[PDB]
Design a protein around this ligand. Structure first.
Ligand code: HEC
Ligand code: HEC
Ligand SMILES: [Cl-]
Ligand SMILES: [Cl-]
Lengths: 108, 108
């Protein structure tokens, strides 16, 4: 994938309707079904403090950046076979760019 | 991964020593142990005419670009479990950037 900066505003509404059910983004925010995502960019996968991951999410051990995040969110179980993130993917490149633009700022 | 343009000149030497054994890049160049790589950027994985790929590589169905190429070359079998490309990987980021800088140009 090749991330290109998008709309944080549109990204925020995507997050609210496609991600929030399972994730929070704020520093010190709670784990839910999925891990709190504060500090996710620039950190290896499977390391949110206190969250119990699958073996696959741990073994992937990928340093999250805007490009491999875009690939992951296109199709999570293709990027991390054995994941337990029950999300099918964002099929539109503009959607991934908007979402990641928001997520970069929100999880900073 | 986050590709950054590097040295095409150094990339050519890296391709000679690490890839050429199994790959050609020229338009109409032969398949060898590995597929000819002409036009690889902007092609989906496993789709070059006349080459017999693994199911793994076909199923990955990745649209090759500079960033996912960089993740791939770091560790091919980790990115595409089941691939028959016998290559340990380019562990140095500058080496991947140089190689991909060369490869983008050479496969046009
Ligand atoms: C529940 C139904 C979820 C939805 C909808 C989304 N995610 Fe998720 N995510 C969920 C779980 C249970 C997990 C852990 C999976 C595992 O195998 O252990 C995750 C994981 C992630 C990650 C990786 C986190 C890390 O490596 O530390 C990311 C980056 C992530 N989730 C982001 C994300 C986004 C942006 C979503 C909306 C588009 C989204 N997830 C949906 C659960 C669920
Ligand atoms: C033989 C010993 C190889 C060496 C050295 C390198 N590669 Fe390779 N590669 C090889 C095979 C047998 C295959 C097909 C794998 C399969 O599972 O079918 C490949 C594949 C690639 C690809 C994907 C091609 C496509 O999807 O059409 C790329 C982009 C690629 N190889 C690049 C590449 C580079 C840049 C190398 C040097 C660093 C390199 N390979 C080494 C066999 C061999
Ligand atoms: Cl050639
Ligand atoms: Cl190396």
């Amino acid at each position: 994938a090749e991330f290109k900066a998008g709309s944080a505003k549109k990204g925020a509404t995507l997050f609210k309707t496609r991600c929030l059910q399972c994730h929070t983004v704020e520093k010190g925010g709670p784990h839910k079904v999925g891990p709190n995502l504060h500090g996710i960019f620039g950190r290896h996968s499977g390391q949110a403090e206190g969250y119990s991951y699958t073996d696959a999410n741990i073994k992937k051990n990928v340093l999250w950046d805007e490009n491999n995040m875009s690939e992951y969110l296109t199709n999570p179980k293709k990027y991390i076979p054995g994941t337990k993130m029950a999300f099918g993917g964002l099929k539109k490149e503009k959607d991934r760019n908007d979402l990641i633009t928001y997520l970069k700022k929100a999880t900073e």
